[PDB]
Design a protein around this ligand. Structure first.
Ligand SMILES: *Cc1cc2c(cc1C)nc1c(=O)[nH]c(=O)nc-1n2C[C@H](O)[C@H](O)[C@H](O)COP(=O)(O)OP(=O)(O)OC[C@H]1O[C@@H](n2cnc3c(N)ncnc32)[C@H](O)[C@@H]1O
Ligand SMILES: *Cc1cc2c(cc1C)nc1c(=O)[nH]c(=O)nc-1n2C[C@H](O)[C@H](O)[C@H](O)COP(=O)(O)OP(=O)(O)OC[C@H]1O[C@@H](n2cnc3c(N)ncnc32)[C@H](O)[C@@H]1O
Ligand SMILES: CNCc1cc(=O)oc2cc(OCc3cccc(Cl)c3)ccc12
Ligand SMILES: CNCc1cc(=O)oc2cc(OCc3cccc(Cl)c3)ccc12
Lengths: 499, 494
């Protein structure tokens, strides 16, 4: 019943908030809808896999908050396999390569690809991380889909196809579904194109030994009976001196403040008294989550390595159920496995199939991409379609359709009386990720500490020391990358010389 | 506790469903979240206005279901005033006109405007009302916004500005917010551009004497204690023999079937056991409602009529708070008033102001457009910002952003075990309107009657005889309207 702060949601963000408040000496309760903590993270354990992350998994350089939290909890990381060659599969053929981006040989196509990535980052620099709606051309960019932007920017089909895959993979949505402003913000607030797409030196560099679910689990262990499982929140009443929070299983909690640590749209599952202000009322109906099935195929051995393939495949084309894979083999070299994502419309299309039918399609794809009959011999399979989750709404995160971020973005983390907002969606650095979950949960917690007069205003937002274990190499460009013309830039140059 | 069918929501759709089931001899309960019925319809009564519709108000020819239901309940209509001239206000000047479309005099602009409207209806002819995702170009059109389509189609700024207003007014959303496929479906399923934009012979022809709220109120009267007010549904459990429906005020209802008669996205406010199927689970997060403030300014007399203006104003441009008005004067000629809509982003922008600040802005606009100082002397004001409503989500209706209708549209009215789906959003003719509310409520009710083996499958969807009181006249076009080239067509000829 009675406490200082009720945290709604026991994912990483809610757990990080609750831990900070608990450590500060406050009495906290975490009300979690599911029979488990972790939310969009979920580590399955069984004899066949030992452990496997079926939700969020990867961490990397510049994600210093999740790294610090995990380290404090006694967790370790290991590096995702990228020793051997990556594969880009396009128009039914595989092209091995090294470095984060597939090589492009055609001079015109090269200019177009180079300009595409450069322009994404150029536009990103115009967008404040903490206020994307303040970008000089916010309205113009928000009123266009990523599809429209790619149609304008990409003078080759090659670049447009790879860019489309980029968007699908980053935000588990179609290019025509999402705002260009929001997408450009999302990439920029992860540190840019190179950082977001990279394994070595990027977001996919590492995983936690034993799974990411341990973050939320170990915090639950620290908090003991303060975490209440199978307590879906249905009602929040702020009309009286103390806030009243009611659960589906009929319990009532009373608190000074509340942290909402759930996906923004999932605030719709709560009836509010008094009603939410107009802007938040409408915002929470305008912010869907993406669509993805995470699929892990197990093999007797990591046989791809013998062919000098690391297990990374970037697979273009409608027929391919999976557009991206990574080696998911244990650091010990056993439980050989390939992780793949079925993205956006394909998650909808292929959800119709049986688990066995999806396994077959994935193996047949991998056999072709890897030129390896061994891919047709899986030993085990695990998968999770996040689209079916009542208490997530999708994965990885919330996307903004055209027009929404400028009109409603400012209220995303604006407090509503004594309700403060956590959740990765409200972060300003790696929003959408476990890192963002920690940033937002701790910031929301500190907003409450400030409201209680326990800390000064300048302590609400806090910098994070760089990890000593996972140092971040800077993102660099070459002179040629900086200065080579775009395709229309080249055509202008040609038209000028021929005059 | 125990009944045959629980209807969630006591708007027109839920009430129409409940009435049909009740009349068929089933025991029905309507669970309504608010302390009132009517939902997106709301008639306010006070001495100053007598009555005023602050929500849905207009009905017209081809909307035979709402007309039949209202007539049965003892309601009458009257005609919205369209005797005198309409006004199109463009680049700071008023241009009076007659007929449903504002005239264009420049020959290039004429071809562009003519082509715009014609093309909307041309495209609509390929979109099945009951399955827009089956349009031959469904994916191509769904993956584009209306902004993109208008950018392609409109060779003049004049046409683009008017087309933009058209979209904003029809669906209370920006052109860049909405799917082209969904918008073209929406217009087509109302009978096309002429029918949707017309007062005389169209959707805005009539209002109900005493207000549209009387539809839901009078059905509540018929059902008596079967309607439970202030019972927001929070939980639906279908794991057992009978469906269990729980309300926020702790009550439990048990039924054979449920009708969900709430806006699709408001399904999110209900916790489901077992969880919803994947497609519906995500669908209900992808379907927002539009944004609108409905504003009624009252005057001593309908002074505009003296200048041979009917009170209809179509007002282009960003600066104007209100893009469209109609005369809201009572049939008796008293309670003179102008109804105006503050649409889409302007609803968001102007919500920050006080009621008095909005009144001043509207009066000053109307004085400019009507060319009358009388507009500066209001006697009363009423308004309603539908964006603030927890149990509507907005008004008039649900819009589909790009990519959604093709991917999720088919599950809108697909039953989930023993839950059937009503609500105007699930209609196939005048979806978005009170007419669609009736169609969907009655159809959902009949799905349940069929599930119970009480009627055959071919009786689930039923035709409606034409109203004798509000007969429809045909929509016509001229030879020149049909055959004049577009701007690029004229350029190809050159
Ligand atoms: C699903 C997914 C996510 C993911 C990804 C791959 C998949 C398939 N890959 C990632 C990766 O490699 N690295 C990374 O950093 N992130 C990755 N993501 C995203 C990541 O999982 C999320 O960003 C993060 O886990 C989000 O954390 P957050 O704490 O913000 O949100 P949550 O996990 O969704 O937790 C919300 C909790 O609230 C509970 N809930 C929901 N509604 C209620 C109500 N009404 N009452 C009480 N509790 C509620 C949920 O059950 C959940 O536990
Ligand atoms: C708001 C509006 C609507 C409108 C319009 C102008 C405005 C400002 N102009 C119209 C017009 O001139 N002519 C016309 O035909 N329609 C016009 N519209 C739209 C019209 O009002 C709607 O199409 C129609 O009213 C919709 O009816 P429907 O029955 O389908 O939906 P509803 O009215 O929203 O009713 C839903 C009810 O459900 C209750 N509710 C919501 N959640 C719950 C839960 N969880 N539990 C129980 N009840 C719930 C709502 O309170 C509501 O009463
Ligand atoms: C930021 N989005 C999350 C994300 C999770 C992931 O597991 O792999 C990615 C791989 C990505 O890029 C791989 C890549 C490499 C080369 C070209 C293209 Cl298009 C994409 C981008 C994002 C991700
Ligand atoms: C479809 N939407 C509902 C609707 C309610 C209404 O009250 O007036 C309208 C007026 C409309 O059109 C008026 C009009 C006339 C001439 C040109 C343009 Cl752009 C619009 C269209 C829809 C409506």
């Amino acid at each position: 019943n009675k406490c200082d702060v009720v945290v709604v949601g026991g994912g990483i963000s809610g757990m990080a908030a609750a831990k900070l408040l608990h450590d500060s000496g406050l009495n906290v309760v975490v009300l979690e809808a599911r029979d488990r903590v972790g939310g969009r993270t979920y580590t399955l354990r069984n004899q066949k896999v030992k452990y496997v992350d079926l939700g969020g998994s990867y961490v990397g350089p510049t994600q210093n908050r999740i790294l610090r939290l995990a380290k404090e909890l006694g967790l370790e990381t290991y590096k995702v396999n990228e020793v051997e060659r990556l594969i880009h599969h396009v128009k039914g053929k595989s092209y091995p390569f090294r470095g984060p981006f597939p090589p492009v040989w055609n001079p015109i196509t090269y200019l177009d690809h180079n300009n595409f990535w450069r322009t994404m980052d150029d536009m990103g620099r115009e967008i404040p991380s903490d206020a994307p709606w303040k970008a000089p051309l916010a309205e113009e960019w928000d009123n266009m889909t990523m599809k429209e932007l790619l149609d304008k920017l990409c003078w080759t089909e090659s670049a447009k196809q790879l860019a489309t895959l980029f968007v699908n993979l980053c935000v588990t949505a179609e290019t025509h579904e999402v705002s260009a402003l929001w997408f450009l913000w999302y990439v920029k607030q992860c540190g840019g194109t190179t950082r977001i797409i990279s394994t070595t030196n990027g977001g996919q560099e590492r995983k936690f030994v034993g799974g990411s679910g341990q973050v939320s689990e170990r915090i639950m262990d620290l908090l003991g009976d303060r975490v209440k499982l199978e307590r879906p929140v249905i009602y929040i009443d702020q009309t009286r001196e103390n806030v009243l929070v009611e659960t589906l299983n009929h319990e009532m909690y009373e608190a000074k403040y509340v942290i909402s640590a759930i996906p923004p749209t999932l605030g719709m599952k709560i009836h509010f008294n008094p009603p939410l202000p107009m802007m938040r009322n409408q915002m929470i109906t305008r912010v869907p989550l993406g669509s993805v099935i995470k699929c892990i195929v197990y093999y007797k051995e990591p046989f791809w390595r013998k062919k000098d393939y690391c297990g990374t495949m970037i697979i273009d084309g409608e027929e391919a159920p999976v557009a991206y894979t990574l080696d998911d083999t244990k650091p010990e070299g056993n439980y050989a496995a390939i992780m793949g994502f079925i993205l956006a419309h394909k998650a909808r299309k292929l959800a119709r199939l049986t688990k066995e039918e999806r396994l077959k399609k994935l193996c047949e794809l991998y056999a072709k991409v890897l030129g390896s009959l061994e891919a047709l011999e899986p030993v085990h399979y695990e998968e999770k379609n996040w689209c079916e989750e009542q208490y997530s709404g999708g994965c990885y995160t919330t996307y903004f359709p055209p027009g929404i971020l400028t009109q409603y973005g400012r209220v995303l983390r604006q407090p509503v009386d004594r309700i403060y907002f956590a959740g990765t969606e409200t972060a300003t650095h790696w929003s959408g990720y476990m890192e963002g979950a920690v940033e937002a949960g701790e910031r929301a917690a500190r907003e409450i500490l400030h409201a209680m007069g326990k800390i000064p205003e300048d302590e609400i937002w806090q910098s994070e020391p760089e990890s000593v274990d996972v140092p971040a190499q800077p993102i660099t460009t070459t002179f040629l990358e900086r200065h080579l013309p775009s395709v229309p830039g080249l055509l202008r140059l040609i038209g000028l010389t021929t005059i």
